C-alpha cells in the first residue's frame, strides 16, 4: 500500500524497533500491508462449580466474543 | 447482569464438552467485560542498515480505534 497512513505506521514500527533495541535502521519502503480488524469483548469470569464428588470449586474463565459476528469461544478455564 | 450469567453457563458447558469433566454451574462470583476494538496491521518493510545495505522485516502494530494508542507487537527479519 501507498496509503500515507500505512507508511506512517510502518515508520513508527521501525522507529520503535530502534528505540527498543538501539538498532538505527532507516525506513526505506513499505512493500506489503495486511489489516486485521479486531472488535470484540473479552469476558473474565470467576465461577463456582459443583465438582464430581459434590465439591465446590472456583474457576476463572475467559470468553472471547466477536461483536459484529456470531462468535463466542472459551479461551481459558482455570482453577483458583 | 443475567447475560453475563449466560456466558458463564456456556463457559462451563464448553469446558465439559471439551474435557468431559461434567462440572456443574453453581454461582457467578466475579465479572469483568474488556472491550477490544482496533486494527492489527501486518507490514513487510524494507529498511536500510548500518551501513548500508537493504533488508526486509516483518512488523505487527496494534492500533486502537477509539483511543489514541498504537504499539509495536513484533519486529522480525524475514528469513
Automatic annotation (TrEMBL), chain B:
Family in the record: Belongs to the cystatin family. Phytocystatin subfamily.
Lineage: Eukaryota, Viridiplantae, Streptophyta, Embryophyta, Tracheophyta
Annotated Cystatin domain residues: 1-78
Record's protein name: Cysteine proteinase inhibitor
GO molecular function terms listed in the Swiss-Prot or TrEMBL record: cysteine-type endopeptidase inhibitor activity; identical protein binding
Organism: Saccharum officinarum (Sugarcane)
Keyword Amino-acid biosynthesis: no
Keywords recorded for this protein, A-Z: Protease inhibitor, Thiol protease inhibitor
Amino acid at each position: 500500500e501507498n496509503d500515507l497512513e500505512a507508511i506512517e505506521l510502518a515508520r513508527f514500527a521501525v522507529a520503535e524497533h530502534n528505540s527498543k533495541t538501539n538498532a538505527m535502521l532507516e525506513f526505506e519502503r513499505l512493500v506489503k500491508v495486511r489489516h486485521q480488524v479486531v472488535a470484540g469483548t473479552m469476558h473474565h469470569f470467576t465461577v463456582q462449580v459443583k465438582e464430581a464428588g459434590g465439591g465446590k470449586k472456583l474457576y476463572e474463565a475467559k470468553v472471547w466474543e466477536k461483536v459484529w459476528e456470531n462468535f463466542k469461544q472459551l479461551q481459558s478455564f482455570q482453577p483458583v
